[PDB]
């Protein structure tokens, strides 16, 4: 049926909910979504009721969103509250570490400094900083308060016992848990830093802007980043400790009425949301403050379906809380494999390297990026289009694949390969412009030469994203299985249009096979035709093919032989790079360089001569270059990546 049992943790919350149900009943028909309320003693009895299929939804702060994801509860974020303008909705806050300009210490130099905290046991003022600095704290780390007092050289942690931990009140004697304590809360924690009492303030991104209106006054302040560098207070999105969701609606991971919660809460915000009805208000009640939802909310947003608790909260938030709860404190590299073909090869690599490289399988590339992100795997080799996505997901590039013959391959950076449009010499009617209503063969959707470059140049022409309407049919592995762009694929049953080697037309060679057998245009790297023609590929289909029988489509409606690629390419493509978790650069760089010197395109492109070093280019923007990022950006409207949609919901 269509009822959502909402969990109320008090008497006043339970009556606002009876009013919520009754007001909904008055504006939604019998068939539609309905609320029903369930009363519980605490938020933990709520998380428990949902998990035990008694209730369906409850709104929670980040700390509780963590406890609800753990087993045996296994709940997940489904809907979020937003604050401020519809243009820039403020779903998340940024926990920052504010300092004074030129005090000259980094995150790794906090020991011996004077700290200012919002309060003991508060999220950005205590839980996040102390959770991350956990292993920098002296032994014995228990009680935590003793360890914090022996780390800093004087603090102000309001709501802490000054009788037991006097160093924690040195800056605000008494550790007063009210606004009567000048250094209490965000304004006080900032005041503690402003008055020169402390050297660091654990606050939110907003605090400085709420306390200093003058940009010249704020200029005398900086933030501490985790990379052990400082940045201006207005660069908080690029320099923070954690990115934390404000208030989130949670439901069961399996059989939780996710779409029925969304329907009800979207309908609710349209009738009784911010400045809508004189009758009922969703974000206000006479019976109390922050009942069911925060009063400050402007409404709701759907959480992308790919989003899981760990990802939603972020690696930083999860890492800090794990350290606080667990207390657990101190190679080899887990390589992600793309289906059974890559895994077969990865297995030989695992035993031969004798426990230097380990393996994990995933059916898609974005599933693998997601394994890297959380920790299920550590690294994998990606194409340019997937470096953009993987990077936007927080991951970084560590080694670049080099393809040119060089003296010192390892330290000679390359400009990239070339994206080309391959036709048969026989189909002489074909011109770059004469492609409408014809058959295409893509490596996979989201790939540089196969997708992002030709579909970007097509989008700049037809000014629409229906590429399946433009072509008659084709094979672009990764597309919707009911699209015309999956009709020319060769995959067996479910394996049809799959973005792995189970699909016979996936990849550079696969797209070339597509052109020979079914298609009339293939989108690949400049060296695909030579690598398969003239016997070089022993496979039945390729064995007797010669490169003299294939041509290239030039942007000026011209055709040239495959060898004349230099002046008949769609665009230059950034080289495939090995991406990893920021906190793994060093080890991967070390073991891959070590490994590389010791030892289809399985794991790496078969034309890789070696893995080359990166310098100041340790970011996707820096690695791919200003030009490629701009071209991928122009295709955001046409995106189908459920992972990109999720990652940009946190960092647009």
């Amino acid at each position: 049926d269509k009822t959502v049992r909402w969990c109320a943790v008090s008497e006043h919350e339970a009556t606002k909910c009876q009013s919520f149900r009754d007001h909904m009943k008055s504006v939604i028909p019998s068939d539609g979504p309905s609320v029903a309320c369930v009363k519980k003693a605490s938020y933990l009895d709520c998380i428990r009721a949902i998990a035990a299929n008694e209730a369906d939804a409850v709104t929670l702060d980040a700390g509780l969103v963590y406890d609800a994801y753990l087993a045996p509860n296994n709940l997940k974020p489904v809907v979020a509250e937003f604050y401020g303008s519809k243009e820039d909705p403020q779903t998340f806050y940024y926990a920052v570490a504010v300092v004074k300009k030129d005090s000259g210490f980094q995150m790794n130099q906090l020991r011996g400094k004077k700290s200012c905290h919002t309060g003991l046991g508060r999220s950005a003022g205590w839980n996040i900083p102390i959770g991350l600095l956990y292993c920098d704290l002296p032994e014995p780390r228990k009680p935590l308060e003793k360890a914090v007092a022996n780390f800093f050289s004087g603090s102000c942690a309001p709501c802490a016992d000054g009788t037991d931990f006097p160093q924690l009140c040195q800056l605000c004697p008494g550790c007063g848990c009210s606004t009567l304590n000048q250094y209490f809360g965000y304004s006080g924690a900032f005041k503690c830093l402003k008055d020169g009492a402390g050297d660091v303030a654990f606050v939110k991104h907003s605090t400085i802007f709420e306390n200093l209106a003058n940009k010249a006054d704020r200029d005398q302040y900086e933030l501490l980043c985790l990379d052990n560098t400082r940045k201006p207070v207005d660069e908080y999105k690029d320099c923070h400790l954690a990115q934390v969701p404000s208030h989130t609606v949670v439901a069961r991971s399996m059989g939780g009425k996710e779409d029925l919660i969304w329907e009800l809460l979207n309908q609710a915000q349209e009738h009784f949301g911010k400045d809508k009805s004189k009758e009922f208000q969703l974000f206000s009640s006479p019976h109390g403050k922050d009942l069911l939802f925060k009063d400050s909310a402007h409404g709701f947003l759907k959480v992308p379906p790919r989003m899981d608790a760990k990802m939603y909260l972020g690696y930083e938030y999860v890492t800090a809380i794990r350290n606080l709860r667990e207390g657990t404190c101190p190679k080899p590299v887990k390589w992600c494999a793309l289906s059974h073909h890559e895994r077969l090869k990865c297995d030989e690599w695992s035993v031969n390297s004798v426990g230097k490289i380990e393996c994990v399988s995933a059916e898609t590339t974005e599933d693998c990026i997601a394994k890297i992100m959380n920790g299920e795997a550590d690294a994998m080799s990606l194409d340019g289009g997937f470096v953009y996505i993987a990077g936007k997901c927080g991951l970084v590039p560590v080694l670049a694949e080099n393809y040119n013959k060089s003296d010192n391959c390892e330290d000679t950076p390359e400009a990239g390969y070339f994206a080309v449009a391959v036709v048969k010499k026989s189909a002489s009617d074909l011109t770059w412009d004469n492609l409408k209503g014809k058959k295409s063969c893509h490596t996979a959707v989201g790939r540089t030469a196969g997708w992002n470059i030709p579909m970007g140049l097509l989008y700049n022409k037809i000014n629409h994203c229906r590429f399946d309407e433009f072509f008659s049919e084709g094979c672009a592995p990764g597309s919707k299985k009911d699209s015309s762009l999956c009709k020319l694929c060769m995959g067996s049953g479910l394996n049809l249009c799959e973005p792995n080697n189970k699909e016979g037309y996936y990849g550079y060679t696969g797209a070339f096979r597509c052109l020979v057998e079914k298609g009339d245009v293939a989108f690949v790297k400049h060296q695909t035709v030579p690598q398969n023609t003239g016997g070089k590929n022993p496979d039945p289909w390729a064995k007797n093919l010669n490169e003299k029988d294939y041509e290239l489509l030039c942007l000026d409606g011209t055709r040239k032989p495959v060898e004349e690629y230099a002046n008949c390419h769609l665009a230059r493509a950034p080289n495939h790079a090995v991406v990893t978790r920021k906190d793994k650069e060093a080890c991967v760089h070390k073991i891959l360089r070590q490994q590389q010197h010791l030892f289809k395109d399985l794991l790496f492109r078969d034309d890789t001569v070696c893995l080359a070093k990166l310098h100041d280019r340790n970011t996707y923007e820096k690695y791919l270059g200003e030009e490629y990022v701009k071209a991928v950006g122009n295709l955001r409207k046409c995106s189908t990546s459920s992972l990109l949609e999720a990652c940009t919901f946190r960092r647009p």
């Binding site: 753990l70 990865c346 426990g355």
Partner: protein
């Protein structure tokens, strides 16, 4: 962290397989122990024929009751020997059940191995335990045909190891193994067979109940996730959702209780039969004459047939 999936250590696997082949050997043990009793009984037949030869040639004076009890023994014993062999089949069968229960568990874990990184039986490396690491489980390449059969090589020599059932059971207790030698902690070997939480035995949900491998050897709560925190305890000692418990008292495990009960029973019957033969042998001896006593087994039977065929005709 929570997605962490530990593997059973090979030394804990071999120790279970060791017990499993001791239990297969119980059939050979009851057969051998029953062969002793027949030796003791044949000595009674050789001593009664020794008496009949004296009879057909003090306080032994009553000839009637000597031969009435002798004919009685010929029947009274075989119906009590029937009773001991009946107990031997049950002790041999009940033992074989416990052997199979432990075998399926370890064998399934041994087969759930995949090239590198993910497997259920570990040796510390990123390579699953192979037949050479599982020497007490398999006699070559891992498979159904390489597991030890009851007539097999080591089952027979296990049956003569002078080890007692109570000692071999102790060998797989939590103390005897040690907390760090049972499971490989702090490692993600992807073995879903040791996970009751969602993404384990079931892909999206915790179990509705506790779970056990063996019949109470390895025990899990309804929602075990991450680093396995093994403690000593039994199937009943799983209180929380997180609980992992390896047997501290193997004689409290379901499948072993019947092996103890029924082997003790056979021994109880075997000992009762043994004493009966001893008390009979001792009372027949005081009637046998020295001429017939010093007589060798071969000629003793030749002489009986002589007086036997004399009296018939």
């Amino acid at each position: 962290y929570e997605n962490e999936r530990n593997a059973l250590n090979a030394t804990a696997a071999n120790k279970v397989c060791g017990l499993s082949t001791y239990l297969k050997g119980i059939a050979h043990r009851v057969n051998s122990e029953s062969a002793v009793v027949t030796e003791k009984l044949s000595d009674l037949k050789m001593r009664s024929i020794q008496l009949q030869l004296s009879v057909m040639r003090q306080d032994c004076k009553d000839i009637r009751t000597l031969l009435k009890t002798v004919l009685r023994n010929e029947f009274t014993f075989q119906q009590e020997l029937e009773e001991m062999r009946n107990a031997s089949a049950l002790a041999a069968a009940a033992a074989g059940i416990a052997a199979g229960r432990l075998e399926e568990w370890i064998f399934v874990f041994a087969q759930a191995a995949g090239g590198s990184s993910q497997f259920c039986i570990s040796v510390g490396t990123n390579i699953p335990a192979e037949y050479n690491n599982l020497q007490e489980c398999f006699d070559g390449t891992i498979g159904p045909e390489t597991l030890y059969k009851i007539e097999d090589s080591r089952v027979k020599e296990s049956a003569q190891k002078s080890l007692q059932l109570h000692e071999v059971l102790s060998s797989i207790s939590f103390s005897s193994l040690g907390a760090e030698s049972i499971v490989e902690k702090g490692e993600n070997r992807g073995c879903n067979l040791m996970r009751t939480a969602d993404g384990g035995l079931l892909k999206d949900v915790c179990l509705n109940r506790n779970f056990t491998w063996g019949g109470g050897v390895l025990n899990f709560g309804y929602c075990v996730a991450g680093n396995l925190k093994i403690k000593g305890g039994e199937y009943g000692d799983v209180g929380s959702h997180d609980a992992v418990r390896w047997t501290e008292d193997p004689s409290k495990v379901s499948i072993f209780k019947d092996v103890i009960r029924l082997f003790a029973r056979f021994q109880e019957v075997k000992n009762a039969v043994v004493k009966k033969i001893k008390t009979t042998v001792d009372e027949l001896t005081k009637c046998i004459g020295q001429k017939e006593a010093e007589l060798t087994n071969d000629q003793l039977y030749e002489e009986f047939e002589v007086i036997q065929k004399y009296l018939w005709f």
